[PDB]
Design a protein around this nucleic acid. Structure first.
Ligand SMILES: Nc1ncnc2c1ncn2[C@@H]1O[C@H](COP(=O)(O)OP(=O)(O)O)[C@@H](O)[C@H]1O
Ligand SMILES: [Cl-]
Ligand SMILES: [Cl-]
Ligand SMILES: [Cl-]
Lengths: 738, 791
DNA sequence: AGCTGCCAAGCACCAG
DNA sequence: CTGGTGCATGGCAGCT
């Protein structure tokens, strides 16, 4: 009668579509929780037993197979932002101290919690207000002292200088709240969470949210991983590899040595792609199975598949023996064999065990001698009762007699009605049905004790011998994790080498001065979805050629050449081969892309006001080591104010900063900077006006544009001949003051 | 792979396949026993759509048949899932009595559930219409028809071209759309939910004419006005054929067809309807729309009427004026009426289920309850001195006699279904009471028997009980079962009990049961006889429910007009809009900060207004509130202003920015082609260019065409100052702007419309504000100056 | 104050 | 031939 989640669940049924009285049936509860937790709801239920949150789940039902699922904690100190991100499924722990708001944007974009944690002291709500899975936390939780002790307790030693996170408090606070929230939901220790690291910005190539979205790295603009760079590159054969590949794409790195290693790896492995993958496909999501082992929730089929992986190691060892590559061999060693455990599990568990342990049938016969005997006793008792059925049927002549069973009455003999009158004298009746009568006899109950007590003693030992396995395997968890790390990395590398082969990517060769030198380069995502031949394009950007002014019609052609550039760098500085014939590329410290739509529109500020704020970010932070992409800025204001701003912008980018820029514009006036400035040149996109359409060429020729194709499109859109004729007049007369 | 000849299938499957063959594409619920079965693909597909298990049904030879199914009583929930996923289901039943059947009992498909023909409450949304529509492209134009099966509203139009057809579908939003196989222009239709590809022969004109006429019961269709709409009549032909084939009873509530023709309403293209946020916001939701502000109606059938009215503003003066002098007249009575109207409820659809002979007892319950409010409203509306309100009151009626019948026939507050008894109240039928006497007189007698026997035996635990299988029994705990009389014939056994029968008990079981069942079948006759009595007054009852709906809307609008402070607009001869203190009807309510009122003055002399200012400055709101004030005026409503004076309007255009290109250029082309001097046109960006003065040259030429030739009333907002040069060159084009001021370090917006073009575009000030380095802002200021030296 | 498995009813199966 | 059984999902009696 009283209360419940009914009122707050009519809320979430309103937003999953199942209906103050809405609900879910029992048989699909795990699938329905799978989508509330999906969109971030801290559930725990009863028509309390179990507790589940969106940031702390390990059940492979409730997690999306191919993507990370992080729990994170944020707070805005008087000085700066403190932030931490845990992967409850791998024990991958991150900690960070963003300085400015723009850094705290770029993290939240890259990382993307399914369950955020935040404090009252936090006043910059515009950063996280419209976020999935928001939870609110007190003062005490963000603590610095209990944190250290609780952290150092979790990990190992009496200090965190080994992890390198010691003299950075704002991050330790986040971490402190996070771990203590995560152990709470679990109500069990977390041995897999054995370390923690802090990314140092200065290492990775820095990409802000707007840049990270506009490139569509893991996520397209609409919301999916459809039609995105991941989609085209992720041909990995294990889920843990898929995850790793994505984390890699968002974290391109500047240590050109760490890259060169990955390039020589992709090289050596390029031939073994054929039969290195069908083996690796069978390693499965070991990284997550191992997490269910740490949390002691790993089901029979988790251990069965863990074993199946162990079978693939000597084969992978044997294949990677051939590979003449120092770093590939490091990964061969790190993959390990664990042959003793392979044997333990083969002996300890049958072919294909059931979904759950609850009802026995998991531990294979031979492993433990006690358990075998009990089964034979229980098969022993099962035997006589089958005999008894036959014994009794032919003895009485009643062909419809049956020995049956349920928890209500235990074992029972069942004659049908009509034949029921011929029931033996000693047959104690017990239960009449529409067309049957059920009896018991002294012997039956005697053997019923036999079957049940036998089963019960074997079934309760299965669970001991099972829980034992964990105490036998968990000591190695250390190495086991580094195996599934090494494996997931093979998946990724062996993929990045196959992709390079069957998409004809070249190997970029880095230079020490800033500059890009693409030769027949393409947008890695478009050249696949497009079913017409992709027109490749060149690019040269020495510091003698610092900025290209791109004029002529946009229509996607411009904002591709630009976007394909940023991706050929991204892909370079991630070690992967790149979609081109040759690519020499210099160091890049930051990638900026102010390209495409958007527009807010939630904050009442407009497109333009957005574009400028994005352009403000660029000008303030862009170094001579940065790539800068600027789709036709200056639209949506008076022709003069926008030309002045595009001029003023190009001026400061072409001189004060010097950054490697592609500057798209419609303004013809801007095509005079090659005459007024050092190191700035003109390129344009053509169109051909064939038949009854205009073909928007995507080929980048040199020089400014000598034609504007606006009126031309108007004619094709149905705009009356008379008006375009009158437009043409006014164009001519506006252009011949300029 | 097996050859399956007809004669090889088991007798059951033969009856299935000739039935499924009649419905090859849609799912088929095959009533078999207490379940509705599905088979083969129907079973696999149905298993996935419903989360029900797939299974086998055994065969002698050959592979077993796939099967899924659900119990006949759980049927609705599952129909609900399927209909809300756009699937149709054919509901097939058992006709004959299987006891008198040696072979398979006769089985017929009795109705078909489809997303466009649903009429039961549990499957429809209350505050929203759910229409079925048919679409047909001729050698010359289009034919489109709509039906509201749960109210009978059956309309017909013949859209001129691709773009109007686009308007209509956007507006009506049918939940199921019947198109001919040879439909030429498919980008109009594909994607849409509940599509239904119909064979060309279903759009035959003669069949349509003859079949519409049979249904309406007239010789020709001249009184309806649709005798000269061939194309329309066709789509209506197919829309009707479908309706009958889905329902499979007669449809007496579908009694009339009227025709929509564009001249009778302000036409509004897809973009316009979506941009004005009339019933759906810019981001899909129903929140912060014109209707969220206006709909405070108290019944669902009113909400839906208002929502329709909002989308089809009438141009006929008399209706408008009548509506006005009603809204005014009813200003004070908007507390006396409303809560009494609330209790009338969704009578519209209740009468639909009555038309279909499908109404549940509680539908009658709520129908009675609604009738009881009619003398309480009649006595209220008499007082009001309003010529139309009396006409509506006359229309509303009383149904003194029928309110009576429902008080005598049915109980206080009945169960959900008739199915198993308890609906018809005492004294309505003596024979039902005779059989209920026998029932009650046998039950209490059996309880006397309980006591009678407990003495006769002394056994204290003796009970009398009833179980569905065995029936009436005498229960003795096993602890005393031995002490049971020799009279007692043991019938059922349990673990701690033993149940018996005696020929007295079984004699009175057979009387209580036989008499209970005679009551049931009699209630079921009595209940299905109510329809026979009420149906004769369907027409009168329908137009009453209509009058209650319209009143619900008008009463609401009156209250709205008071609560939110609107004024009555007046209409003029010439085109024009003269607004005094014109505020945005939705944006004024969502704000906390008092909404700045703002005038407007458009006439044939002053027909275009170039709106300068900066973005964020309030430019769009101004344009939008202009169209919204116009639309409300033209549904008869009061207006969010002080004094609004408005000329005849035929269309309202919207070219407000953001594509998804080429789009914006077409929507512009659409305006230039179809705009007359009675239309209102609101534009943000007519289309971008690819060079500096490229696209700007279009805007100029277009403004010129709208001003010189079309002479539409235009509101053109723009940042391009080259266009504030237009009032100098062009006749009847003026300059206005939204005021903003820089107080040094930041910038504020006045939201007030001033004459003359803005002092400057604040492009640079906004960039500065956005964070662009002072450093660079300065540079731009210098480059500006030199541009204005030659300008 | 839950859970378990009989049963609903048509028709086909199939073991005696 | 006769008398048993299978087979969807839901409801309730018969048991803790
Ligand atoms: N008359 C007004 N009074 C008060 N606020 C207004 C008024 N007009 C507009 N606003 C507010 O100004 C904001 C921007 O208005 P909008 O018309 O979108 O500007 P623009 O069209 O120039 O970009 C809106 O969010 C609205 O809340
Ligand atoms: Cl058992
Ligand atoms: Cl009507
Ligand atoms: Cl502006």
């Amino acid at each position: 009668f009283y209360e419940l989640f009914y009122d707050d669940a009519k809320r979430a049924s309103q937003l999953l579509d199942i209906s103050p009285m809405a609900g879910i049936p029992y048989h699909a509860v795990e699938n329905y929780l799978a989508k509330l937790v999906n969109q971030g709801e801290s559930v725990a239920i009863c028509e309390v037993v179990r507790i589940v949150t969106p940031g702390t789940i390990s059940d492979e039902a409730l997690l999306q197979e191919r993507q990370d699922n992080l729990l994170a904690a944020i707070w805005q100190d008087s000085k700066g932002f403190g932030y931490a991100t845990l992967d409850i499924s791998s024990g991958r722990f991150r900690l960070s101290e963003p300085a400015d708001r723009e850094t705290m944007a770029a993290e939240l974009q890259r990382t993307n919690p399914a369950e955020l944690l935040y404090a009252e002291d936090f006043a910059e709500m515009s950063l996280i207000e419209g976020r999935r899975g928001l939870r609110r936390r007190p003062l005490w939780e963000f603590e610095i002292d209990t944190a250290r002790q609780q952290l150092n307790l979790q990990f190992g030693t009496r200090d965190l200088v080994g992890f390198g996170v010691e003299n950075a408090p704002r991050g330790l606070c986040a971490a402190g709240c996070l771990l203590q929230y995560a152990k709470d939901t679990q109500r069990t220790t977390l041995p897999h969470i054995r370390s923690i690291t802090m990314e140092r910005e200065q290492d990775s190539i820095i990409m802000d949210a707007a840049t990270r979205r506009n490139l569509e790295i893991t996520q397209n603009l609409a919301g999916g991983a459809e039609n995105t760079l991941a989609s085209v590159l992720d041909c990995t054969v294990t889920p843990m590899g898929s995850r790793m590949l994505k984390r890699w794409l968002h974290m391109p790195v500047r240590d050109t040595r760490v890259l060169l290693e990955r390039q020589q790896t992709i090289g050596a492995l390029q031939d073994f792609t054929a039969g290195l993958q069908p083996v690796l496909r069978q390693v499965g999501d070991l990284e997550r199975i191992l997490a269910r082992l740490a949390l002691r929730t790993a089901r029979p089929r988790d251990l069965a598949r863990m074993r199946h992986a162990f079978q693939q190691l000597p084969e992978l060892r044997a294949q990677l023996e051939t590979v003449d590559s120092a770093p590939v061999q490091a990964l061969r060693e790190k993959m390990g064999e664990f042959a003793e455990l392979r044997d333990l599990l083969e002996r300890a568990i049958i072919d294909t065990p059931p979904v759950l342990v609850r009802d026995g049938g998991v531990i294979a016969s031979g492993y433990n001698e006690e358990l075998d005997e009990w089964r034979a006793l229980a098969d022993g008792a099962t035997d006589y009762l089958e005999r008894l059925e036959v014994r009794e049927r032919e003895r009485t002549g009643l062909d419809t007699l049956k020995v049956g069973f349920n928890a209500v009455h235990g074992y029972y003999i069942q004659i049908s009605r009509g034949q029921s009158h011929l029931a033996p004298i000693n047959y104690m009746r017990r239960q009449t049905l529409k067309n049957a009568e059920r009896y018991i006899i002294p012997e039956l109950k005697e053997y019923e004790d036999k079957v049940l007590t036998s089963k019960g003693k074997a079934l309760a030992l299965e669970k001991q011998l099972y829980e034992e396995l964990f105490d036998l395997l968990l000591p190695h968890l250390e190495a086991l994790q580094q195996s599934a790390s090494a494996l997931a990395e093979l998946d990724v590398l062996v993929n990045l080498a196959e992709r390079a082969y069957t998409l004809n990517y070249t190997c970029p060769t880095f230079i020490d001065k800033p500059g890009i030198r693409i030769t027949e380069g393409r947008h890695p995502v478009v050249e696949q979805v497009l079913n017409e031949p992709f027109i490749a394009n060149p690019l040269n950007l020495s510091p003698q050629r610092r900025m290209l002014i791109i004029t002529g019609p946009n229509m996607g052609g411009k904002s591709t050449y630009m976007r394909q550039t940023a991706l050929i760098a991204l892909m370079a500085y991630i070690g992967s081969y790149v979609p081109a014939q040759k690519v020499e590329i210099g160091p890049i410290d930051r990638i900026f892309t102010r390209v495409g739509a958007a527009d807010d529109l939630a904050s009442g500020r407009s497109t333009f006001m957005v574009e400028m704020t994005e352009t403000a970010n660029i000008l303030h932070n862009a170094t001579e080591y940065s790539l800068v992409l600027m789709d036709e800025i200056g639209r949506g204001t008076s022709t003069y104010d926008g030309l002045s701003l595009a001029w003023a912008c190009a001026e400061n980018l072409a001189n004060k900063i010097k950054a490697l820029t592609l500057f798209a514009t419609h303004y013809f006036e801007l095509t005079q900077l090659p005459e007024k400035m050092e190191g700035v040149a003109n390129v344009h996109l053509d169109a051909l006006e064939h038949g009854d359409t205009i073909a928007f060429m995507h080929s980048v020729q040199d020089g400014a544009a000598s034609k504007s194709y606006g009126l031309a499109v108007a004619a094709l859109a149905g705009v009356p001949k008379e008006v375009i004729k009158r437009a043409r007049q006014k164009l001519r007369e506006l252009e011949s003051i300029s």
